[PDB]
Design an enzyme around this catalytic site. Structure first.
Site, mmCIF file in Angstrom:
data_model
loop_
_atom_site.group_PDB
_atom_site.id
_atom_site.type_symbol
_atom_site.label_atom_id
_atom_site.label_comp_id
_atom_site.label_asym_id
_atom_site.label_seq_id
_atom_site.Cartn_x
_atom_site.Cartn_y
_atom_site.Cartn_z
ATOM 1 N N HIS A 277 -8.305 1.224 1.853
ATOM 2 C CA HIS A 277 -7.220 0.630 1.410
ATOM 3 C C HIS A 277 -6.765 1.325 -0.366
ATOM 4 O O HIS A 277 -6.040 1.054 -0.667
ATOM 5 C CB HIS A 277 -7.473 -0.835 1.270
ATOM 6 C CG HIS A 277 -7.517 -1.399 2.626
ATOM 7 N ND1 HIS A 277 -6.329 -1.104 3.534
ATOM 8 C CD2 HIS A 277 -8.309 -2.222 3.020
ATOM 9 C CE1 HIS A 277 -6.731 -1.936 4.608
ATOM 10 N NE2 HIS A 277 -7.870 -2.519 4.399
ATOM 11 N N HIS B 42 -10.325 -0.820 -9.259
ATOM 12 C CA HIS B 42 -9.793 0.084 -8.319
ATOM 13 C C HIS B 42 -8.372 0.503 -8.553
ATOM 14 O O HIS B 42 -7.635 0.329 -9.514
ATOM 15 C CB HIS B 42 -9.547 -0.648 -6.820
ATOM 16 C CG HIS B 42 -8.768 -1.912 -6.970
ATOM 17 N ND1 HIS B 42 -9.259 -3.186 -7.372
ATOM 18 C CD2 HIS B 42 -7.516 -2.025 -6.644
ATOM 19 C CE1 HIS B 42 -8.317 -3.985 -7.190
ATOM 20 N NE2 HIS B 42 -7.213 -3.413 -6.724
ATOM 21 N N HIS C 70 -4.106 1.997 -7.592
ATOM 22 C CA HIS C 70 -3.012 1.877 -6.766
ATOM 23 C C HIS C 70 -1.856 3.084 -7.047
ATOM 24 O O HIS C 70 -1.798 3.185 -8.230
ATOM 25 C CB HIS C 70 -2.198 0.569 -6.779
ATOM 26 C CG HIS C 70 -3.038 -0.519 -6.342
ATOM 27 N ND1 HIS C 70 -3.062 -1.080 -4.939
ATOM 28 C CD2 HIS C 70 -3.992 -1.759 -7.137
ATOM 29 C CE1 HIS C 70 -3.808 -2.070 -4.832
ATOM 30 N NE2 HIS C 70 -4.343 -2.414 -6.016
ATOM 31 N N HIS D 242 -6.724 -1.591 -11.635
ATOM 32 C CA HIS D 242 -7.117 -3.052 -11.556
ATOM 33 C C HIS D 242 -8.237 -3.406 -11.904
ATOM 34 O O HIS D 242 -9.312 -3.105 -11.094
ATOM 35 C CB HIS D 242 -6.509 -3.755 -10.257
ATOM 36 C CG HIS D 242 -5.123 -3.752 -9.963
ATOM 37 N ND1 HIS D 242 -4.729 -3.945 -8.793
ATOM 38 C CD2 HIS D 242 -4.026 -3.916 -10.872
ATOM 39 C CE1 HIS D 242 -3.176 -4.144 -8.744
ATOM 40 N NE2 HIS D 242 -2.960 -3.928 -10.317
ATOM 41 N N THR E 79 -2.929 -8.795 -4.454
ATOM 42 C CA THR E 79 -1.791 -8.260 -3.873
ATOM 43 C C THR E 79 -2.174 -7.540 -2.601
ATOM 44 O O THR E 79 -1.603 -6.950 -1.880
ATOM 45 C CB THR E 79 -1.133 -6.857 -4.950
ATOM 46 O OG1 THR E 79 -2.604 -5.860 -5.104
ATOM 47 C CG2 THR E 79 -1.104 -7.517 -6.236
ATOM 48 N N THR E 80 -3.227 -7.885 -2.118
ATOM 49 C CA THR E 80 -3.833 -7.645 -0.789
ATOM 50 C C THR E 80 -4.160 -8.965 0.215
ATOM 51 O O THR E 80 -4.481 -9.928 -0.474
ATOM 52 C CB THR E 80 -4.796 -6.663 -0.722
ATOM 53 O OG1 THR E 80 -6.124 -7.230 -1.332
ATOM 54 C CG2 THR E 80 -4.544 -5.421 -1.412
HETATM 55 C C1 LIG Z 1 -12.400 -9.466 -3.543
HETATM 56 C C2 LIG Z 1 -11.208 -8.844 -4.361
HETATM 57 O O1 LIG Z 1 -11.476 -8.680 -5.737
HETATM 58 N N1 LIG Z 1 -10.277 -8.692 -3.678
HETATM 59 C C3 LIG Z 1 -8.995 -8.194 -4.263
HETATM 60 N N2 LIG Z 1 -8.026 -8.212 -3.422
HETATM 61 N N3 LIG Z 1 -6.840 -7.757 -4.046
HETATM 62 C C4 LIG Z 1 -7.145 -7.593 -5.359
HETATM 63 S S1 LIG Z 1 -5.619 -7.154 -6.466
HETATM 64 N N4 LIG Z 1 -5.250 -5.804 -5.932
HETATM 65 O O2 LIG Z 1 -4.811 -8.044 -6.554
HETATM 66 O O3 LIG Z 1 -6.637 -6.558 -7.761
HETATM 67 S S2 LIG Z 1 -8.523 -7.876 -5.639
HETATM 68 ZN ZN LIG Z 2 -5.422 -3.915 -6.980
#
Ligand SMILES: CC(=O)Nc1nnc(S(N)(=O)=O)s1
Ligand SMILES: [Zn+2]
Ligand SMILES: CC(=O)Nc1nnc(S(N)(=O)=O)s1
Ligand SMILES: [Zn+2]
Lengths: 224, 225
Positions: free
Chosen positions: A63, A88, A90, A107, A173-174
């Protein structure tokens, strides 16, 4: 399981599992930062100043490309002690600013011992090469897997020196898209080279940005 | 009733009473404590709030509050949206608290656009000078669940302070279904009601009928200059 396309795509997230019900609610992320729903006011100083990241773990989870941090970094905000867990990528960006999209959004996910989540989002435009990013991309798995980085990372070089930011109440956002997430988006972007963007896209699933969500009754506050 | 302020159907159990009440246990609920720590002052839209005289309005005791449904078509223009006043009701003690402070009465003016956007204007009342408009309402308000149509006109504007400065945040309905996405506007200046009026209200309306304050979570409150 979920994805960014097909029947497991964003529009179908809430229907995939009962726990994903949040994905269809009223305080979802990301959003378009629209001047109409934005006010300007003095906000708390954002003091990150992360410790050097040693032997961090670079993960490709299908992802995104995520980097898990080993050190205990404390982000003091509104009297809460948030600990940086990972950061991470995007591509393209998830948030848009006045409808402007950036090729990359980073993020930095923080969490307090009691579960409060605060994500710091950093935009990146094409420009000068970012030294830290090369260290990460050189070992990032092109397929789902994990790899320990032998080089230290200066996380602070992946964030603009100018800490002016905008904030709003949102969500992950996931899936499960949990709300009550505190979003902090830096006003100034950092730069990455075209080469680095291409490299990232060669190892990370893309596009992996969730469509912008309805602002509903929320206000965005931009600091000074 | 499907829900209550006490017992098995009390506030902490709302979300478990019906699937439609799932909102009640989420992260952007109302009311909240208006705390300076989570508030900033900024330039917000001017609040242009003035209502038409309410004629032959319906005063209802629904077992949860005393609600007044007005016949007129009032529009509140805010952020390009046109919100229509649907009704206003009472809570004692106040639902929202200011810096931990509670008021004897909080009035809610509920507005909704045609496409479902909800905007509630909250007005606090402190003990003091008697409010004439309130008297017209209380004099006919059913002590038992029922309805009574007023013969006298009501000037809703006399239940609202002259000073229209306010505080706002994103919240929810304070009663099931607790729908979120609600725009809350709470006036900074309170109006006044006599101690006797408060006693009279409590003699006909279920009380206390204020929902416990909810977690602010990741929200900010904005007060307009
Ligand atoms: C465990 C964890 O951190 N999960 C997340 N899922 N989406 C995220 S986000 N894109 O909103 O930063 S972080
Ligand atoms: Zn994110
Ligand atoms: C139909 C309608 O207006 N329902 C309401 N439920 N709670 C409200 S409140 N206390 O948040 O003003 S209004
Ligand atoms: Zn109410």
């Amino acid at each position: 399981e979920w994805s960014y396309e097909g029947e497991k795509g964003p529009e179908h997230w809430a229907q995939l599992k009962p726990e994903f019900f949040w994905c269809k609610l009223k305080n979802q992320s990301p959003i378009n930062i629209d001047k109409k729903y934005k006010v300007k006011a003095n906000l708390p100083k954002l003091n990150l100043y992360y410790k050097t990241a040693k032997e961090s773990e670079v993960v490709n989870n299908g992802h995104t490309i995520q980097i898990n941090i080993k050190e205990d970094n404390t982000l003091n905000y509104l009297g809460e002690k948030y600990q940086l867990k990972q950061f991470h990528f995007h591509t393209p960006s998830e948030h848009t600013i006045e409808k402007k999209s950036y090729p990359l959004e980073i993020h930095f996910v923080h969490k307090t011992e009691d579960g409060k989540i605060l994500v710091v989002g950093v935009m990146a435009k094409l420009g000068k090469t970012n030294k830290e990013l090369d260290k990460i991309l050189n070992v990032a798995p092109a397929e789902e897997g994990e790899k320990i980085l032998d080089k230290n990372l200066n996380l602070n070089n992946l964030i603009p020196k100018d800490k002016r930011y905008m904030t709003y109440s949102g969500s992950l956002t996931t899936p499960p898209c949990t709300e009550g997430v505190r979003w902090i988006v830096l006003k100034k972007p950092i730069s990455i080279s075209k080469q680095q963007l291409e490299k990232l896209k060669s190892v990370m699933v893309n596009p992996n940005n969730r469509p912008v969500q309805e602002i509903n009754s929320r206000w965005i506050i931009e600091g000074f």
